[PDB]
Amino acid sequence: MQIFVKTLTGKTITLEVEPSDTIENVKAKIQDKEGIPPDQQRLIFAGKQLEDGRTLSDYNIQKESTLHLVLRLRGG
């Protein structure tokens, strides 16, 4: 499937995933497209931050579904 990851800058970065994709691995695909280290990204869905150990399915995120990407808002 694919999901839409709207960045803070209003850019939809669509990526391909499974419902079983973990958030760590999603952040790694964001790094592949945006060049931000996964340790330095934050991810929101429906007004809550996600955590690395979870999956799209944990949050009931399905196909053609929208997320937020922010940088961690930490220097490193």
Partner: protein, 111 residues
């Protein structure tokens, strides 16, 4: 329907020369006259412009204080994260208060 030129309206008109003329006689221009030669010239602007380099006071009747900051290049010590210059307002309205507060941290951390 004409009129003669003035000869008395101000001291420069009474002397029939602007102070700029006697200053140009005293020193023709800056040292750049030694360069940008090309056998001929349409105008001296490709050269010392028979003068000295202008400043904004010669273009707008105001003054400006001495600078207290530098901008040698626009892409060094930059935000290097999505901040005020580029965070989208619809996405920011959707984005939860948790990161709105953390993002105000990122705006305070600007340079």
């Amino acid at each position: 329907g004409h009129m003669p030129s003035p000869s008395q309206l101000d001291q420069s008109v009474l002397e029939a020369l602007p102070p700029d003329l006697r200053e140009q006689v005293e020193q023709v221009c800056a040292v750049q006259q030694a360069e940008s030669h090309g056998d001929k010239k349409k105008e001296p602007v490709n050269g010392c412009n028979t003068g000295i380099l202008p400043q904004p006071v010669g273009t707008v009747l105001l003054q400006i204080p001495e600078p207290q900051e530098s901008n040698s290049d626009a892409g060094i010590n930059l935000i290097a994260l999505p901040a005020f210059s580029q965070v989208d307002p619809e996405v920011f309205a959707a984005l939860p208060a948790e990161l709105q507060r953390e993002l105000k941290a990122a705006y305070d951390q600007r340079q």
